[PDB]
Amino acid sequence: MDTSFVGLTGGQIFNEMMSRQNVDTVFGYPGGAILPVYDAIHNSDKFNFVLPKHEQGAGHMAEGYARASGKPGVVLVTSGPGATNVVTPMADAFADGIPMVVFTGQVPTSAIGTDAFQEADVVGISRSCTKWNVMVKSVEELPLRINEAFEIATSGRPGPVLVDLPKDVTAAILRNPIPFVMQSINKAADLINLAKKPVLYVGAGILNHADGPRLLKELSDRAQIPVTTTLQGLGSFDQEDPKSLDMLGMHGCATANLAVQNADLIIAVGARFDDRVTGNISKFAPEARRAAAEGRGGIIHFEVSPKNINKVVQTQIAVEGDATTNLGKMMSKIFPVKERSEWFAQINKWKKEYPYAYMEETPGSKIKPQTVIKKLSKVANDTGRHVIVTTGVGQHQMWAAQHWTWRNPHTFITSGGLGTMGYGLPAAIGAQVAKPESLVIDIDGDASFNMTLTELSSAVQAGTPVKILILNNEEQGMVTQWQSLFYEHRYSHTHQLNPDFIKLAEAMGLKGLRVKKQEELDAKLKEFVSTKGPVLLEVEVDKKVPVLPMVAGGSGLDEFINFDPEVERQQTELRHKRTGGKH
Amino acid sequence: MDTSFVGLTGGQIFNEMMSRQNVDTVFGYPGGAILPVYDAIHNSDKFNFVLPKHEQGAGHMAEGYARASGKPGVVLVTSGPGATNVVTPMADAFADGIPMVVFTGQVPTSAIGTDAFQEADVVGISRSCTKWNVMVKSVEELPLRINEAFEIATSGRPGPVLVDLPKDVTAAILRNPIPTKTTLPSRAQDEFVMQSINKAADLINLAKKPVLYVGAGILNHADGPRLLKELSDRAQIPVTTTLQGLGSFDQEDPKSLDMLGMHGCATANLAVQNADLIIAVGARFDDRVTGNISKFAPEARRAAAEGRGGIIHFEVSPKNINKVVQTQIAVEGDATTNLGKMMSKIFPVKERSEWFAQINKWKKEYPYAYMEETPGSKIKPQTVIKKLSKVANDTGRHVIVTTGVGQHQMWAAQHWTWRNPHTFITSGGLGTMGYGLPAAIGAQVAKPESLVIDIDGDASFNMTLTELSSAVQAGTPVKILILNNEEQGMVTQWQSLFYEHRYSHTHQLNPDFIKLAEAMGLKGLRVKKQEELDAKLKEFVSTKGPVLLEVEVDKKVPVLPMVAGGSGLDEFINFDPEVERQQTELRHKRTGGKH
Ligand SMILES: Cc1cc2nc3c(=O)[nH]c(=O)nc-3n(C[C@H](O)[C@H](O)[C@H](O)COP(=O)(O)OP(=O)(O)OC[C@H]3O[C@@H](n4cnc5c(N)ncnc54)[C@H](O)[C@@H]3O)c2cc1C
Ligand SMILES: Cc1cc2nc3c(=O)[nH]c(=O)nc-3n(C[C@H](O)[C@H](O)[C@H](O)COP(=O)(O)OP(=O)(O)OC[C@H]3O[C@@H](n4cnc5c(N)ncnc54)[C@H](O)[C@@H]3O)c2cc1C
Ligand SMILES: COc1nc(C)nc(NC(=O)NS(=O)(=O)c2ccccc2Cl)n1
Ligand SMILES: COc1nc(C)nc(NC(=O)NS(=O)(=O)c2ccccc2Cl)n1
Ligand SMILES: Cc1ncc(CNC(C)CS)c(N)n1
Ligand SMILES: Cc1ncc(CN)c(N)n1
Ligand SMILES: [K+]
Ligand SMILES: [K+]
Ligand SMILES: [Mg+2]
Ligand SMILES: [Mg+2]
């Protein structure tokens, strides 16, 4: 038995447990039910505390922190509204597999089920958006539940867990002492050595191991296999390398999508074949299916969660467990490929004919959002500092993914599964806390920013010099794009009235910069990244600009729509006509 | 069967059902999954659409709208994050009995359970915080589900309901005729209710020290206040209301006891503790009202044991009957309706001289005392409320007050003079900080001619301040008052009292509220000096468009009286200027001079 906790309150035990769990930062907001814990951590030197203005902010900050550090994000909020306010961050973390331990205060056990003040069935509400949750029933089991929580949140596919803490439990004083894969790997190696047009389809899974990108590069080099990544995989592969296919999917480049449709063997590494990547499932990877029917190729899936194997598409070989680990074991079984003339020739043909094209700036026209990303990408890189990027949700998010040059793992923190608008700012703040020395940039949209802009003041109080970039098109761009394309340009409530972003930033205690003219863009971006403290830069960009290429509806990854200058001009005329000149 | 909808999309059917449900306002935010519905309501003149900056804002706006109009608040958001962002507003409406119909877009029925883009098990997540919810599986059942939603939301004890709308269902065209019933919005029992009514009348006619304990329930019927007043006058029964019953009884009436509870006045609490009969009308005996339950209403319990009194409860929901305390008589159904049926059985009372004399001694002895302004001191929050109550009330306009959560909320409750029904819109059960602003916007949409004032706290305001721009876009001239004490007051108060002045993370860094207001497109005003308070309050109230007024108030000031812990309603802590001064000194030492 152990007695190192005897005599301590549940809250004090919590304080100690954070230390034992190597927790160096806690994001939270106090409240009545959780007071016993806040009293115990008052002026605690075991970890730093970050106070947001809204619990949702604490949640997304914790996700940002976890994404940039690899450590679980710890949240501490009160009962009722405190707990319900973190449901979105949990659902978000659940969708993207982010390690997060949410601690929610709860009314006394003697008040549960009586419709008590600020009481909510948090365990029930968060059941579908947590890998596991529980309500601590006594101080004796607090250490155990805390240990199980951290373990579960960081095992298998990382995810969020919730621990409900009744007020009487955290106030209570502890009085008494307390207590085959190899086979798949072999077949996988043979299939690869037998592939004539292989493709590595890499996702976030490869980033869950410090050696992930290293081994990925090793395999790519050894077998000379081109690599394409999902949105969440960006950064795991050097895009400067000739073997990089860039991003695939709904808004991925043509090369990446075509290679996937013509590949005889798809090597899926830490990717779940979500509906934003596969396109029309029945049309997905036609050549791989043909190679599978001929026993000369198909799909190999390195997946840690059995539930995600054969969930979307039938695979030929499944390698269960950590991807990085299994890739290391298979390495030696892989035959060094000299070169793939034909494969690389076809791929390079596509790259030269299908680049991320778009309507560039013309004399007197407004600034193009794509151009802003390309310029900022270079300006940021030229600082020589470690750069981390977060984003909101929408077009600006896709443009950031496409036009930025990814080379470093854990440098792109964006909401993909749930796609939570407002993620940008709080995520950046969290990331900055995790990497104090890094340059953290939040590439945001005006609508997304409006969702959680109150956290600007939190950036100041937390001492996080985040760089907030707002690509202002005065519209919910991603939605208007769908409205333009699928709903005859009927913009139904997709234009919110924006506040003055510069005056807002200043009101919040940040420096505010704005750019309207092309001739001032370069200087503004430079001043932006070189500013010492937190700063916000608003760039007025062109409106109703579609993100291309694009695969939607029943279209296959190869049935994408590409950019065409003449088509854009025709759409503009049609749009003006249908909106009476309003848009 | 009905064939009139054949050929329409689920979205168009939705649009049509709104007018049949008498919906004139919808609060929402677009998204992919809900696009089919948005395209259908594009430029629709069936109703006004209000766009917030965050779904939580749409939810609280809908609540404020519902509280002010008596009509269900309608929310229309997208799947995933759009739906999870309305969980707080739903849980808030569930706790406070607010009618709301939440429509959430959902991924196509064929993608459900596949971890699809922006997919969430919304029906599962909101199960515990809705009176009922459902996922529409086909366009054929859309009309039926909508009708059931509105009926459940507005019947019994009002509350929120959620209707999940798969994208393929709203985009689908109805190709099958459907039952006309699904498209259109006991003697023994009534005899039993009348029996309990007669039994309640007999008990009331026997009472010598009765007290009417009134809550939100009396406000769910237009004639509630009138009938309450009639009974009060007829039987000479003094009236106390919960936080949610404020406005149901004219506080200018001699028989008004003001608010009871944790922070209620001593007169109301003592009256309840000494009454031989407690007549609970539309109130649920929650824990912020009863104090230590074992010490609650000792005289009424003694009267019950002697068969000459006890507790009568006019409750509409079986779930809240005999849930907290044993009652002698429960009168089921709508309180107002039942008071009407009971009236003629109540013996008119000439006077209750002794009972009233005792009550008046308490009123003179325990007013809502506090440390008033002194030379050079900062403005006192309680003083702001008293002054504003008079300025606003004097305009002659219909006034509606919303608030945030905390001390400012309690001071607003205590120091404002309540006289009109549906004029106090506050978050009581869940106590959601950030409620103030969006609720005011929704309330203003419901009542365009009313003077809508949000008495907010600085920390509460920070939660949802982004909705300021929504107020401008919606054209709602709300008056935002921020009693800025640069702290989470209600929490620091508890830390001062129970945690020896250890303020753990209860001081958030505020932005410049005046510059914020201007940046958001509103007029901004600030007051620091006592000498300028009157002028600023007058400018505040007479400004035409939306306006924000920040009042810097004194810090670490406790809300009193206070009944907490194991204390009974009669074991309250009262204001004492000497004790406040000693506590102030103790605080400065303990905090190392930080506070
Ligand atoms: C506006 C918008 C547009 C989008 N457009 C695109 C687009 O065009 N292209 C695109 O790619 N995405 C796009 N997305 C993102 C998309 O929804 C998905 O979030 C993303 O594709 C998922 O990528 P992932 O599978 O790599 O990561 P995850 O969803 O996190 O899935 C990772 C998979 O790896 C497995 N795994 C995890 N850890 C390990 C380990 N240690 N060892 C082995 N296996 C592991 C998991 O359990 C899981 O099956 C978009 C999102 C938004 C908001
Ligand atoms: C900081 C803070 C401090 C607080 N301090 C206090 C305080 O000191 N005093 C206080 O009173 N409250 C206080 N509260 C509010 C408190 O938590 C409860 O929200 C409030 O007391 C509930 O009042 P109610 O019972 O009247 O209304 P509800 O909670 O809405 O309950 C109404 C009851 O009436 C019934 N009913 C509804 N409609 C009808 C009808 N048509 N016919 C018949 N019956 C019906 C319901 O079903 C239910 O049982 C505080 C809250 C906060 C956030
Ligand atoms: C306004 O009431 C209030 N404010 C704060 C800051 N803390 C509390 N705490 C409280 O009531 N604690 S309690 O644990 O006795 C409790 C009893 C019943 C239901 C819930 C809770 Cl937390 N109250
Ligand atoms: C960026 O993707 C996006 N953006 C908008 C504005 N709408 C949609 N809609 C969409 O994908 N619709 S779908 O109904 O075919 C769908 C398929 C699978 C899972 C969810 C959804 Cl909504 N997408
Ligand atoms: C929080 C939130 N609300 C709404 C949406 C809806 N859809 C988009 C992408 C834009 S208006 C979202 N992605 N996130
Ligand atoms: C949303 C929220 N967060 C925190 C608290 C706690 N005092 C509250 N009442 N509401
Ligand atoms: K790129
Ligand atoms: K009063
Ligand atoms: Mg935008
Ligand atoms: Mg305050």
UniProtKB/Swiss-Prot annotation, chain A:
Share the entry's pH-dependence remark: Optimum pH is 7-7.5.
Under SUPFAM superfamilies, the record lists: DHS-like NAD/FAD-binding domain (SSF52467), Thiamin diphosphate-binding fold (THDP-binding) (SSF52518)
Q: Tell me the protein family, please.
A: Belongs to the TPP enzyme family.
InterPro entries, per database record: Acetolactate_synth_lsu, AHAS_TPP, DHS-like_NAD/FAD-binding_dom, THDP-binding, Thiamin_PyroP_enz_cen_dom, Thiamin_PyroP_enz_TPP-bd_dom, TPP-bd_CS, TPP_enz
List GO terms (cellular component aspect): acetolactate synthase complex; mitochondrion
Pfam families according to UniProt? TPP_enzyme_C, TPP_enzyme_M, TPP_enzyme_N
What UniProt keywords apply to this chain's record, in alphabetical order? Amino-acid biosynthesis, Branched-chain amino acid biosynthesis, Magnesium, Metal-binding, Mitochondrion, Thiamine pyrophosphate, Transferase, Transit peptide
Q: Where does Mg(2+) bind?
A: 446, 473, 475
Report the source organism: Saccharomyces cerevisiae (strain ATCC 204508 / S288c)
Reproduce the miscellaneous comment text: Contains 1 molecule of FAD per monomer. The role of this cofactor is not clear considering that the reaction does not involve redox chemistry.
Give the EC number(s) listed in the UniProt record. 2.2.1.6
Q: Which residues bind FAD?
A: 157, 251-272, 303-322
| Reaction catalyzed | 2 pyruvate + H(+) = (2S)-2-acetolactate + CO2; 2-oxobutanoate + pyruvate + H(+) = (S)-2-ethyl-2-hydroxy-3-oxobutanoate + CO2
List the subcellular locations: Mitochondrion
Q: What does it do? A: Catalytic subunit of mitochondrial acetolactate synthase, which catalyzes the first of a series of common steps in the biosynthesis of the branched-chain amino acids. Catalyzes the irreversible decarboxylation of pyruvate to a bound hydroxyethyl group that then condenses with either a second pyruvate molecule to form 2-acetolactate (AL) or with 2-ketobutyrate to form 2-aceto-2-hydroxybutyrate (AHB). The first product is the precursor for valine and leucine biosynthesis, while the second leads to isoleucine.
- Name the coenzymes or cofactors required: Mg(2+); thiamine diphosphate
One GO molecular-function annotation for this sequence?
magnesium ion binding
| Protein name (database record) | Acetolactate synthase catalytic subunit, mitochondrial
Which pathway does this chain act in?
A: Amino-acid biosynthesis; L-isoleucine biosynthesis; L-isoleucine from 2-oxobutanoate: step 1/4; Amino-acid biosynthesis; L-valine biosynthesis; L-valine from pyruvate: step 1/4
